Design a protein around this ligand. Sequence first.
Ligand SMILES: C[C@H]1CC[C@H](Cn2c(N3CCO[C@@H]4CCC[C@H]43)nc3cc(-c4noc(=O)[nH]4)nc(-c4cncc(Cl)c4)c32)CC1
Length: 96
Amino acid sequence: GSQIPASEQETLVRPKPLLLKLLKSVGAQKDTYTMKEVLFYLGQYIMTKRLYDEKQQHIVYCSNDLLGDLFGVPSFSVKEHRKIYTMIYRNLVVVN
Ligand SMILES: C[C@H]1CC[C@H](Cn2c(N3CCO[C@@H]4CCC[C@H]43)nc3cc(-c4noc(=O)[nH]4)nc(-c4cncc(Cl)c4)c32)CC1
């Protein structure tokens, strides 16, 4: 959907080892993050590796990339905000 709630975007999370690896590949140096930071780094990961489609740039192709293994889909749109949340939550432990 869109506009995920503020307190969700601020949830403190511990990425599991695969998502941690990805985060660390774009310069993140922590064990714990907010969701908004995780999304920031994944953003950066996609930009830097150019995983977006050249012609339809809201589509991300993640087959044959680590991102593909994290999300378990061959692609997704950047407009599908809840789906993205949902795929990322599988890859982390909420901090209590
Ligand atoms: C998995 C990963 C999560 C973060 C997003 C960030 N992000 C991006 N980036 C930003 C960094 O550079 C990147 C290269 C191509 C993609 C570029 N562009 C978005 C467009 C829309 C959009 N356009 O129309 C709409 O409705 N949303 N949304 C977000 C968005 C921001 N924060 C939270 C959410 Cl869940 C989504 C966008 C990309 C995907």
